[PDB]
Amino acid sequence: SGFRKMAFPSGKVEGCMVQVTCGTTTLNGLWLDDVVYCPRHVICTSEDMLNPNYEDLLIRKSNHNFLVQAGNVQLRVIGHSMQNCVLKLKVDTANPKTPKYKFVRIQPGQTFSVLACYNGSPSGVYQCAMRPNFTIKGSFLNGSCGSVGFNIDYDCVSFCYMHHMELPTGVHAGTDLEGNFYGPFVDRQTAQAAGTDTTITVNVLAWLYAAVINGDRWFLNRFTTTLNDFNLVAMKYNYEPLTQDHVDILGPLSAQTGIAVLDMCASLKELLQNGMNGRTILGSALLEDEFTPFDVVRQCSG
Amino acid sequence: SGFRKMAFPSGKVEGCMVQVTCGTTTLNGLWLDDVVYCPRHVICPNYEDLLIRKSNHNFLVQAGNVQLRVIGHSMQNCVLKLKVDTANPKTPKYKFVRIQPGQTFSVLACYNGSPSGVYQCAMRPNFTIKGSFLNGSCGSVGFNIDYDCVSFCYMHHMELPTGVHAGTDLEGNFYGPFVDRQTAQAAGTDTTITVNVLAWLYAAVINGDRWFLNRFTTTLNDFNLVAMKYNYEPLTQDHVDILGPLSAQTGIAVLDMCASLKELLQNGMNGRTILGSALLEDEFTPFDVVRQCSGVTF
Ligand SMILES: COCCN1Cc2ccc(Cl)cc2[C@H](C(=O)Nc2cncc3ccccc23)C1
Ligand SMILES: [Cl-]
Numbered sequence: 188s189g190f191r192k193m194a195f196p197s198g199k200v201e202g203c204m205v206q207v208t209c210g211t212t213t214l215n216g217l218w219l220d221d222v223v224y225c226p227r228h229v230i231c232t233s234e235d236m237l238n239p240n241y242e243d244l245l246i247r248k249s250n251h252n253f254l255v256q257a258g259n260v261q262l263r264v265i266g267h268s269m270q271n272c273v274l275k276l277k278v279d280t281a282n283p284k285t286p287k288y289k290f291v292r293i294q295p296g297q298t299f300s301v302l303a304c305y306n307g308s309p310s311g312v313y314q315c316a317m318r319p320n321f322t323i324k325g326s327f328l329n330g331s332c333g334s335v336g337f338n339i340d341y342d343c344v345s346f347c348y349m350h351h352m353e354l355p356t357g358v359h360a361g362t363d364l365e366g367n368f369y370g371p372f373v374d375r376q377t378a379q380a381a382g383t384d385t386t387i388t389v390n391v392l393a394w395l396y397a398a399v400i401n402g403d404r405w406f407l408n409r410f411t412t413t414l415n416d417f418n419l420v421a422m423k424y425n426y427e428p429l430t431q432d433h434v435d436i437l438g439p440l441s442a443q444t445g446i447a448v449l450d451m452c453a454s455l456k457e458l459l460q461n462g463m464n465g466r467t468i469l470g471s472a473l474l475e476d477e478f479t480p481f482d483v484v485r486q487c488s489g
Numbered sequence: 490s491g492f493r494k495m496a497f498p499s500g501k502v503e504g505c506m507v508q509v510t511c512g513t514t515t516l517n518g519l520w521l522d523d524v525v526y527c528p529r530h531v532i533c534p535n536y537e538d539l540l541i542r543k544s545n546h547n548f549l550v551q552a553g554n555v556q557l558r559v560i561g562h563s564m565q566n567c568v569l570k571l572k573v574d575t576a577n578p579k580t581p582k583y584k585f586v587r588i589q590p591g592q593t594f595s596v597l598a599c600y601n602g603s604p605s606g607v608y609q610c611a612m613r614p615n616f617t618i619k620g621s622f623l624n625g626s627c628g629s630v631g632f633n634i635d636y637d638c639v640s641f642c643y644m645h646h647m648e649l650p651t652g653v654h655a656g657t658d659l660e661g662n663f664y665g666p667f668v669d670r671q672t673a674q675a676a677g678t679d680t681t682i683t684v685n686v687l688a689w690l691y692a693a694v695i696n697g698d699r700w701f702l703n704r705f706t707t708t709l710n711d712f713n714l715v716a717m718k719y720n721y722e723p724l725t726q727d728h729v730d731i732l733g734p735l736s737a738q739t740g741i742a743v744l745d746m747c748a749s750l751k752e753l754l755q756n757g758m759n760g761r762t763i764l765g766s767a768l769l770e771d772e773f774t775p776f777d778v779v780r781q782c783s784g785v786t787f
Contacts (some may be wrong), residue, residue, distance in 0.1 A: 188621075188622075188648060188652030189619065189620050189621035189622055189652055189653075189654070190621055191608040191610070191619075191620065191621035192494060192608065193598070193606035193607065193608050193621060194496060194606065194607045194608065195606065195607070196499045196500075196503050196597060196604040196605070196606065196607055197498045197499050197500055197607065198498075198499055198500035198503040198504070198604075201498050201500040202500065302498065303495070303784075304786070305784045305786050306786065308786030308787065309498040309500075309786065309787060310498075310780075310784055310785060310786040310787060311495035311496065311497065311498070311781065312495065312496045312497070312498055312499070312607055313493040313494060313495045313496065315493070324491060324765070325491045325493065326490075326491035326492055326493040326495065326781060327490070327491055328782075328783075328784040330784065331784070353490060357490030357491060357696070357697070358490075358491075359491070401652070402652075467768070470619065471768075472766075472767035472768045473762070473765075473766070473767050486606070486621060489600075489623070
């Protein structure tokens with residue numbers, strides 16, 4: 188029993204964190220084999236931030252301008268290339284602690300663990316989700332740039348996020364490990380804003396199935412709904428549209444508990460209408476949307 | 490910006506998890522130097538009578554794919570200490586510490602000697618933990634990281650009928666009035682960790698949430714009369730002293746923040762949230778708030 192927001196063990200990722208220094212700027216890098224991946228804005232200075240020409244800034248750099256630190260040992264940079272908004276620093280030593288890894292691009296609603304780092308040193312780990320507005324509600328201070336998000340399904344580390352910036356609302360923007368940003372964001376200090384955020388419907392439904400598996404059935408009702416009538420109601424509460432793919436993905440949880448997806452949808456409809464009325468679901472007074480159907484299956488069963 | 494339930498990096502602890510098998514039972518062990526620590530119920534009760542019948546070769550210890558050979562065994566309260574032939578090369582700088590209720594820690598939940606997840610939790614005033622554990626999770630450990638030193642504070646033993654968890658410190662002494670036996674046991678009535686809620690209200694202020702603040706103050710005695718009415722733990726002068734740095738950083742006296750908490754308890758949140766929560770959060774200590782709102786590394 189018990190349902191906690193659970194992060195992956197960070198050990199495999201800690202053994203890859205390095206500190207990257209270019210001039211006055213210091214941030215984190217990911218050392219995998221003989222390459223250190225870090226945000227390309229490490230080469231940017233004071234005025235070179237509203238409209239930086241990264242190709243023009245990088246051509247002025249030599250390998251010895253980049254100081255890379257792995258614990259107390261300094262790594263020697265022997266090459267550099269840019270791939271979108273990531274800088275790839277070729278180093279003269281391959282990381283012996285390199286785990287079995289993959290670079291994956293995630294879709295909104297997917298979850299991942301974050302190893303928050305400062306000066307190449309890991310300070311904490313937490314679980315979070317790619318919001319539908321492509322931002323993450325993380326916990327990051329100055330110097331956390333270059334921190335990474337990951338999942339460790341089986342013995343392999345899937346890197347899915349690298350942190351680049353904080354938006355004026357306090358939420359965070361970053362890229363996949365190939366340097367492509369999530370969302371309409373740019374690694375420029377221009378006026379940017381996160382779009383209106385919505386609730387991840389498929390995730391809330393998965394968390395309601397987790398509550399049923401853990402013995403909580405107070406919110407269930409004798410009603411069902413059509414998928415169309417559910418979406419019309421859900422849109423009014425700023426909930427993401429629920430698709431037929433989401434219904435198919437909730438299939439295993441539906442068969443395990445004996446509650447049809449559209450039956451669970453009717454219960455969510457009623458929760459949105461009534462609120463909780465002094466009650467909680469899995470120790471929460473709000474509807475939790477940062478657990479996917481896969482996360483529920485993983486923690487509630489294996 | 491941002492305030493998350495943050496666990497310590499588990500790397501140093503992952504390198505210590507092993508699988509312990511005795512007869513039909515399989516659980517986790519903590520391999521530090523040449524000793525593997527695990528719950529004594531792996532041999533299951535008269536534990537002295539059960540242990541005298543076991544030989545070293547009855548305990549199968551697995552470290553990844555490598556098998557460790559047991560060369561001795563002894564009991565220390567409710568922990569079994571299996572002497573092994575090989576010292577763990579991944580042994581970190583460590584200490585065994587006993588924590589007090591209200592103190593927080595990271596839990597590296599494991600199954601079959603393999604770490605599967607890490608989460609943050611607190612020792613409840615009723616000495617239970619609201620964890621997330623399944624069958625096979627026994628022997629999973631709780632820890633804090635202090636500079637480069639890992640302080641092990643918890644070893645999981647059992648789940649109570651309410652779904653909450655009971656375990657011991659690494660010296661085998663249980664937290665709470667629990668016993669390691671299949672019998673009728675219940676967690677006592679739980680209370681809210683007042684000093685922790687106040688620390689989390691200071692974290693909300695640092696993150697720009699000030700709606701709950703007011704012009705009022707209270708006496709420590711008048712606050713404790715109200716707090717006792719709402720199943721909150723008594724707030725002591727030590728708690729007030731510990732909240733000092735957060736009070737000076739935000740400019741809100743502890744008894745001023747206590748007057749805000751009094752109004753939240755009597756009047757509720759009124760459709761509003763604090764740090765994305767509609768309930769008052771009590772599993773962040775004043776030190777957890779300071780460490781996260783300053784970014785200290787390990
Ligand atoms: C206060 O001045 C911040 C200026 N930042 C402007 C900016 C613009 C584009 C890009 Cl890609 C990076 C940045 C930098 C940035 O977002 N850094 C930070 C990251 N993550 C949390 C941060 C919390 C606080 C501070 C800074 C954070 C620096
Ligand atoms: Cl995905």
